[PDB]
UniProtKB/Swiss-Prot annotation, chain C:
Family matches, as Gene3D superfamilies: Nucleic acid-binding proteins, RNA polymerase Rpb7-like, N-terminal domain
Any one GO CC term of the record: intracellular membrane-bounded organelle
Protein name: DNA-directed RNA polymerase III subunit RPC8
InterPro entries: NA-bd_OB-fold (IPR012340), RNA_pol_III_Rbc25 (IPR013238), RNA_pol_Rpb7-like_N_sf (IPR036898), RNAP_E/RPC8 (IPR004519), Rpb7-like (IPR045113), Rpb7-like_N (IPR005576)
NCBIfam families assigned: rpoE
Disulfide bonds: none
Subunit structure, interactors included: Component of the RNA polymerase III complex consisting of 17 subunits: a ten-subunit horseshoe-shaped catalytic core composed of POLR3A/RPC1, POLR3B/RPC2, POLR1C/RPAC1, POLR1D/RPAC2, POLR3K/RPC10, POLR2E/RPABC1, POLR2F/RPABC2, POLR2H/RPABC3, POLR2K/RPABC4 and POLR2L/RPABC5; a mobile stalk composed of two subunits POLR3H/RPC8 and CRCP/RPC9, protruding from the core and functioning primarily in transcription initiation; and additional subunits homologous to general transcription factors of the RNA polymerase II machinery, POLR3C/RPC3-POLR3F/RPC6-POLR3G/RPC7 heterotrimer required for transcription initiation and POLR3D/RPC4-POLR3E/RPC5 heterodimer involved in both transcription initiation and termination.
Gene responsible for this protein: POLR3H
Family, per entry: Belongs to the eukaryotic RPB7/RPC8 RNA polymerase subunit family.
Keywords: Antiviral defense, DNA-directed RNA polymerase, Immunity, Innate immunity, Nucleus, Transcription
Record flagged with keyword Nucleotide-binding: no
Keyword set includes Transcription: yes
From Swiss-Prot, chain E:
Domain of life of the source: Eukaryota
Classification of source organism: Eukaryota, Metazoa, Chordata, Craniata, Vertebrata
Quaternary structure (record): Component of the RNA polymerase III (Pol III) (Pol III) complex consisting of 17 subunits: a ten-subunit catalytic core composed of POLR3A/RPC1, POLR3B/RPC2, POLR1C/RPAC1, POLR1D/RPAC2, POLR3K/RPC10, POLR2E/RPABC1, POLR2F/RPABC2, POLR2H/RPABC3, POLR2K/RPABC4 and POLR2L/RPABC5; a mobile stalk composed of two subunits POLR3H/RPC8 and CRCP/RPC9, protruding from the core and functioning primarily in transcription initiation; and additional subunits homologous to general transcription factors of the RNA polymerase II machinery, POLR3C/RPC3-POLR3F/RPC6-POLR3G/RPC7 heterotrimer required for transcription initiation and POLR3D/RPC4-POLR3E/RPC5 heterodimer involved in both transcription initiation and termination.
Family the UniProt entry places it in: Belongs to the RNA polymerase beta' chain family.
Organism: Homo sapiens (Human)
Compartments in which it is found: Nucleus; Cytoplasm, Cytosol
This protein's name: DNA-directed RNA polymerase III subunit RPC1
Residues spanning the membrane: none
Tissue expr: Expressed in the brain, in the cortex and the white matter (at protein level).
Curated annotation (Swiss-Prot), chain F:
Protein name: DNA-directed RNA polymerase III subunit RPC7
Residues of the full protein shown: 32 to 113 of 223
Protein family (similarity comment): Belongs to the eukaryotic RPC7 RNA polymerase subunit family.
Induction: Induced by NANOG and POU5F1/OCT4. Negatively regulated by the interaction of microRNA MIR1305 with 3 miRNA responsive elements (miREs) in its 3'-UTR. Transcriptionally regulated by MYC. down-regulated upon cell differentiation.
Subcellular location: Nucleus; Cytoplasm
UniProtKB/Swiss-Prot annotation, chain G:
Keywords: Antiviral defense, Cell membrane, DNA-directed RNA polymerase, Immunity, Innate immunity, Membrane, Nucleus, Transcription
Protein name according to UniProt: DNA-directed RNA polymerase III subunit RPC9
UniProt-annotated location(s): Nucleus; Cell membrane
Gene Ontology CC, one term: nucleoplasm
Function (record text): DNA-dependent RNA polymerase catalyzes the transcription of DNA into RNA using the four ribonucleoside triphosphates as substrates. Specific peripheric component of RNA polymerase III (Pol III) which synthesizes small non-coding RNAs including 5S rRNA, snRNAs, tRNAs and miRNAs from at least 500 distinct genomic loci. With POLR3H/RPC8 forms a mobile stalk that protrudes from Pol III core and functions primarily in transcription initiation. Pol III plays a key role in sensing and limiting infection by intracellular bacteria and DNA viruses. Accessory protein for the calcitonin gene-related peptide (CGRP) receptor. It modulates CGRP responsiveness in a variety of tissues.
Tissues of expression: Ubiquitous. Most prevalent in testis.
Listed GO biological process terms: defense response to virus; innate immune response; neuropeptide signaling pathway; transcription by RNA polymerase III; transcription initiation at RNA polymerase III promoter
Chief localisation class: nucleus
Gene name of the record: CRCP
Membrane topology type: Peripheral membrane protein
Residues of the full protein shown: 1 to 124 of 148
GO molecular function term, any single one: DNA-directed RNA polymerase activity
Length: 78, 199, 189, 48, 49, 82, 124, 48, 97
């Protein structure tokens, strides 16, 4: 059974927002509706608050094992 | 000056500037106001897509003269770098395809770093939110002055502007002023009120 | 001639295509990449037979496209020794008769593979054969092709790779045989 | 007809391996020898 | 070492470089095989001694 | 200016061979033996592998071989030829 | 890319023809996207193979035909090569089988040959 | 380069807004749509 | 280049490469130091482990072993620099996964 913390760390927030912003900048599918938005990163933060992002982080332990957690499934906070 | 300590760890950089600083209390504690004559020079290589298309048409109509304007275009279907001094620009607003590149100026609300030279500790470099104003010197709120230890005696400040989304995001989330109020040494708070507020 | 082969590979899908199931997109792309090519050791591929493994879809810093590793299975054209074949005549030369299946064309049949009683022509390009007492000492074939029968007896792979700093052969060829007793003119046999 | 070509392979450095070269290895690496003490033509063109 | 990474120009280990991202992609692993009929051991068990 | 040739000339030239009969016989016996003893099962070439498809020709022109017979009382335990 | 096995399996002409038939089933069932000439290349190769394979005798065979043939001709001392190539030929005379059967007279006899010929001619 | 994106440019000249090096071209009142960064010397230290 | 007299932009000494690590950002550091500044691409041959050019290894006299990498130009300079002193940094290449 998963052992790592159930919260998302600063670094995970940063990288997931970054990569989803890169994706959204291109024509990748989008799920949250947008109020005239124009910047990728704002779309990214909107979705993250909506927990709509299609990503799974695969945390690595030092010995090669790993866990997976759903971004929609971690504990999130401002 | 040798190889390593020269151009391996000390590599120089472009998309940057330098200028004098002066106070401006009437802004928030998370914005730095760049001068207009610098916002025409640092440019962001945006990528046009379904959502943002029409805005960038508005920019490309302008040319390099009006502040919100652009300087170069690069195209998906051919990777040439047209220069907006030339040509009937409005047509090139129509010719855009998703995946093309347009190099826009700085626009109000763009993540931009900021720095003071004699780095001593983590906080000597931060990530503000940009704004444009007609004078010729970097202006920001004075509460942030203790971290930098800057004093408006005639100092110089550098400035950078990243070029890839993931880098932009890391600059905002980690290096934002609002996430770095306490110093990481002992938990003391540094960003606070100053002379003439304390009175 | 048609033979199955087992493959593995890694492939990416640009980030403007996640709107569709990955199995389908990997099918298209993997097809497009192999499409109508020779493999150095096994010859001309036709198409995939089926996929069997779709490893997880990684994403990499600076690239929006996901990256995935695959196990899959493909069909390739490899005739094996002495095997009996049917092919259109592709042409003629003193070095041998030319043969093709329309979709594939790299077959030759030299005079040693030709039937015995005659092994040269009237010096005209078309091969004209002879028999001992019957037959008109002239029977021949035509380039646009009759589907003749032949036995594969030799092959060759040749490296068409480039050499030296950057900036007539074909990689894969076969040899057939028609001289066997009971074999020869298709109008006759 | 065409033989399949690997267009590219995404690659990454694994290790550096420091070591010496022999006189014969040095020959094999070189493109040309240089056997002259002078560098330019004596003419006006200053050609190498 | 991270210093090496600065020398070599590739992302470091610590920080946001420490973990990986997998796409939440519409994917079926080990999808049903395409059958074949020509070959089975029942047909092709060798006849040699 | 112009680097010399790869092979500079030589004033001397190698002494010619001396003729000798029993030595020439030996010369002949050398080229005979080097081709002869390669048959001895101490010599090894690659084992047979990678046949196309079972064709009863392989039954008729089959290759014959039987495992070697070293001295089982002189080498360490694992010496069994298999 | 790597090849785990370049000699994974042989196949009967119907197997590839069956694949070709189901492949032409979806022929241009997608939209008029016209992505690249690779579309044209695969169309050319597949259509030309199908069209030529249409000229082969093994057209219109059936899976149960194949399997029942295999079971029927199991006892005739044949090799995999003989079995598969014969299924790929459907012969009509004893001349060509001697071409196909190595050491024919040392192994078989004309009555077995006739039984095989009748069975293959009728079944396929 | 040489051309503008497609048509009849063949010449190259320098121009630049701000501390840069871009290759003016003169079939389009353009910069060969390319530019290249000049490389130069100094901060160290007629024939023999 | 150097500075304002000759159009040199800015310098980012070691003491800011330290703060970037302090925060722990990685893509920012990578960008700022090799993408934006002086990114360049080079070619190597896996078989011998030496550098080449234009898709060809002059050492091995072969084509099937060369490949192209990204690299900070300063480090390519350094690899061409050591060899003069007969210290040869041979390379072993690997899959990117
Ligand atoms: Mg001061
Ligand atoms: Zn023109
Ligand atoms: Zn090499």
């Amino acid at each position: 059974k998963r052992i790592t913390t159930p919260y998302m760390t600063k670094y995970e927030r940063a990288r997931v927002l970054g990569t989803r912003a890169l994706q959204i900048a291109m024509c990748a599918p989008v799920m949250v509706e947008l109020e005239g938005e124009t910047d990728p990163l704002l779309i990214a933060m909107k979705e993250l608050k909506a927990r709509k992002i299609p990503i799974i982080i695969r945390r690595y332990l030092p010995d090669g094992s790993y866990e997976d957690w759903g971004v929609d499934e971690l504990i999130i906070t401002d | 000056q040798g190889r390593f300590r020269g151009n391996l760890s000390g590599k120089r950089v472009d998309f940057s500037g330098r200028t004098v600083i002066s106070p401006d209390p009437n802004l928030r504690i998370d914005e730095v106001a760049v001068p207009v004559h610098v916002a025409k020079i640092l440019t962001f290589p945006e990528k046009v897509n379904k959502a943002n298309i029409n805005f960038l048409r508005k920019l490309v109509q302008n040319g390099p003269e009006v502040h919100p304007g652009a300087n170069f275009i690069q195209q998906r279907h051919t990777q040439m770098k047209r220069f907006l001094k030339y040509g009937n620009r409005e047509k090139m607003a129509q010719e855009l395809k998703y995946g093309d590149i347009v190099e826009r100026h700085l626009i109000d609300g763009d993540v931009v770093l900021f720095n003071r030279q004699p780095s001593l500790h983590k906080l000597s470099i931060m990530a503000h939110l940009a704004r444009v104003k007609p004078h010729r010197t970097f202006r920001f709120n004075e509460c942030v002055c203790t971290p930098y230890n800057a004093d408006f005696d005639g100092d110089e400040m550098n400035l950078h502007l990243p070029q890839t989304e993931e880098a932009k995001a890391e600059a905002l989330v980690l290096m934002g002023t609002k996430a770095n109020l306490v110093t990481p040494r002992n938990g003391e708070p540094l960003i606070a009120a100053i002379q003439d507020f304390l009175t | 001639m048609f033979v199955l082969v087992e493959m593995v590979d890694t492939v990416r899908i640009p980030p403007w295509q996640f709107e569709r199931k990955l199995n389908d997109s990997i099918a298209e792309e993997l097809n497009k990449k192999l499409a109508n090519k020779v493999v150095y050791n096994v010859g001309l591929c036709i198409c995939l037979f089926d996929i069997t493994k779709l490893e997880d879809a990684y994403v990499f810093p600076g690239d929006g496209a996901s990256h995935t590793k695959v196990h899959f299975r493909c069909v390739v054209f490899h005739p094996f020794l002495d095997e009996i074949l049917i092919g259109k005549i592709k042409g003629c030369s003193p070095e041998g008769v030319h043969v093709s299946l329309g979709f594939f064309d790299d077959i030759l049949i030299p005079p040693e593979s030709l039937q015995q009683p005659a092994k040269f022509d009237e010096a005209e390009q078309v091969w004209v054969w002879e028999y001992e007492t019957e037959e008109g000492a002239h029977d021949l074939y035509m380039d646009t092709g009759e589907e003749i029968r032949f036995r594969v007896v030799d092959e060759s792979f040749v490296d068409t790779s480039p050499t030296g700093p950057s900036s007539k052969e074909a990689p894969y060829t076969l040899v057939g045989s028609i001289s066997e007793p009971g074999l020869g003119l298709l109008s006759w046999w | 007809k065409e033989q399949f070509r690997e267009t590219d392979v995404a690659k990454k450095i694994s290790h550096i391996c420091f070591g010496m070269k022999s006189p014969e290895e040095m020959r094999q690496q070189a493109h040309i020898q240089v056997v002259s003490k002078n560098l330019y033509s004596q003419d006006n063109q200053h050609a190498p | 070492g991270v210093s090496e990474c600065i020398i070599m120009g590739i992302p470091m280990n610590i920080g946001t470089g420490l973990f990986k991202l997998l796409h939440k992609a519409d994917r079926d692993p080990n999808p049903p095989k395409r059958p074949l009929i020509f070959d089975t051991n029942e047909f092709h068990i060798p006849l040699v001694t | 200016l112009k680097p010399p040739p790869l092979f500079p000339d030589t004033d001397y030239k190698p002494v010619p061979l001396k003729t000798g009969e029993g030595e020439e016989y030996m010369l002949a016996l050398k080229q005979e033996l080097r081709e002869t003893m390669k048959r001895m099962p101490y010599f090894i070439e690659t084992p047979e592998e990678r046949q196309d498809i079972e064709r009863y020709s392989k039954r008729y022109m089959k290759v014959y071989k039987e495992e070697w017979i070293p001295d089982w009382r002189r080498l360490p335990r694992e010496m069994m030829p298999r | 890319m790597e090849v785990k096995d370049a000699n994974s399996a042989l196949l009967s002409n119907y197997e590839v023809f069956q694949l070709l038939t189901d492949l032409k089933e979806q022929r241009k069932e997608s939209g008029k996207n016209k992505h690249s000439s690779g579309q044209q290349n695969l169309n050319t190769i597949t259509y030309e193979t199908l069209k030529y394979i249409s000229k082969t005798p093994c057209r219109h065979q059936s899976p149960e035909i194949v399997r029942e043939f295999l079971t029927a001709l199991k006892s005739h001392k044949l090799t995999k090569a003989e079995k598969l190539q014969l299924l790929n030929h459907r012969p009509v005379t004893a001349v060509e089988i001697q071409l196909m059967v190595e050491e024919s007279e040392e192994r078989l006899t004309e009555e077995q040959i006739e039984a095989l010929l009748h069975t293959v001619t009728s079944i396929l | 380069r040489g051309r503008c994106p497609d048509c009849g440019s063949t010449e190259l000249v320098e121009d630049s807004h701000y501390s840069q090096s871009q290759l003016v071209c003169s079939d389009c009142g353009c910069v060969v749509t390319e530019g290249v960064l000049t490389t130069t010397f100094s901060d160290e230290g007629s024939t023999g | 280049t150097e500075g304002r007299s000759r159009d040199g932009g800015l310098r980012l000494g070691e003491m800011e490469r330290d703060c970037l690590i302090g925060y722990g950002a990685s893509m920012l550091l990578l960008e700022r130091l090799m993408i934006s500044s002086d990114a360049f691409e080079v070619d190597v041959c896996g078989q011998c482990g030496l550098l080449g050019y234009s898709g060809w290894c002059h050492y091995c006299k072969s084509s099937c072993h060369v490949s192209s990498l990204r690299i900070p130009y300063a480090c390519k300079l350094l690899f061409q620099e050591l060899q003069s002193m007969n210290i040869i940094p041979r390379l072993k290449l690997s899959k990117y996964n």
